[model samples]
Target: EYAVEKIIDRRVRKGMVEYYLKWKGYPETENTWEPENNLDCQDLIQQYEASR
Candidate 1:
């Protein structure tokens, strides 16, 4: 339960951070998983898997 809360909190914080920074003209330009400004970023997230 604690781990889930921690993960959820992290995601929420990240979302808020993205919103604030982007709206303030400091958009996230260096996305490691995918392109932040691309329209398919979310889809990329859904399919992304690191090499084992």
Candidate 2:
């Protein structure tokens, strides 16, 4: 289980924005970078905006 703290950063190694996520109940080192289609958070847009 995971909850997004915020979008740490973004990447474009190959394609579109790859959101770097900071998870709840986890260490900073444990944060994961996932694609947009992989997550279903309502605040995705907000978080992305916050990053910029």
Candidate 3:
């Protein structure tokens, strides 16, 4: 598993959801998309959405 540096943004298409992730030690260019079911970082995800 990779350390998630930050959860910057997210979007959904129909019933599919994705998160724009900033991973630790990785450059911004390496930031990638992940599905809700693909991640294990609920507390982190909670923080992002709570502010939205």
Give Cα-based local distance difference scores for all models. Answer: 0.23, 0.75, 0.90
Clashing pairs in 2: none
Ranking by lDDT: 3, 2, 1
User: What lDDT score is found at residue 11 in candidate 2?
Assistant: 81
Say which prediction, candidate 1 or candidate 3, comes out ahead on lDDT. 3
Report the lDDT of model 1 for residue 31.
22
Model 1 Cα lDDT, one tens digit per residue, 13-32: 34442211122122344222
TM-score of each: 0.18, 0.71, 0.88
lDDT of 3 by residue, 1-52 (tens): 8999889999996788999999999999999989878888989899989997
lDDT of 2 by residue, 2-48 (tens): 77777777787568667788887789999888877677775865757
Pick by TM-score: 1 or 3, better one = 3
- Model 2 regions lying over 4 Å from their true place: none
Deviating ranges (above 4 Å) for candidate 3: none
* lDDT of residue 19 for candidate 1: 13
Clashes within 3 Å, all models in order: 0, 0, 0
**For model 1, which pairs clash?**
none
| Among all candidates shown, the one with the greatest lDDT | 3
